[PDB]
């Protein structure tokens, strides 16, 4: 298994890593994190899901400016505010911009089909353009299109 490239960003007191690696079974983006209470979490995207979401990356960050502060104090019974959802095979993706008490962050959840293994990461809003970036030049380099 090799790492072909690391991306660290630093946003609202988590970490995130975006990692391109290669194994038997392909190349990938492990995007993994560490949450401001330390509770570490991965997803794992084939690199065009990769661009898929980089692309919707730029319209929940359009949604976001256009919001202003919270409340009024109607949120959704849910919490959340605008959503996507990214196939890929037997893959399902579920990214939904949500607003808790501590403030607004995109959620991103991988299952499975059938199901199985699912999991996620929480991305504070704030920081969506960096990780737009960061996507976009791993994918100028790896992913051709
Ligand atoms: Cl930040
Ligand atoms: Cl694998
Ligand atoms: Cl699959």
């Keep these: 298994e090799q790492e072909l490239a690391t991306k660290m960003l630093q946003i609202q007191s988590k970490r995130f890593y975006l990692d391109v690696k290669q194994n038997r079974r392909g190349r990938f983006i492990k995007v993994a994190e560490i949450g401001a209470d330390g509770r570490r979490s991965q997803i794992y995207l084939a690199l065009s899901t990769a661009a898929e979401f980089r692309d919707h990356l730029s319209?929940?960050?359009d949604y976001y400016a256009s919001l202003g502060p919270p409340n009024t104090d109607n949120l959704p019974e849910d919490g959340k505010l605008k959503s996507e959802m990214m196939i890929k095979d037997y893959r399902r993706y579920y990214l939904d911009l949500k607003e808790n008490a501590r403030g607004?962050?995109?959620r991103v959840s991988q299952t499975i089909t059938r199901g199985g293994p699912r999991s996620q990461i929480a991305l504070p809003a704030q920081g969506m353009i960096e990780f737009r970036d960061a996507l976009?030049?791993?994918?100028e380099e790896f992913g051709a299109n």
Excluded: G, M, V
């Design 59 to 61: 319209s929940f960050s």
């Design 104 to 106: 607004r962050f995109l």
């Design 136 to 139: 976009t030049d791993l994918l």
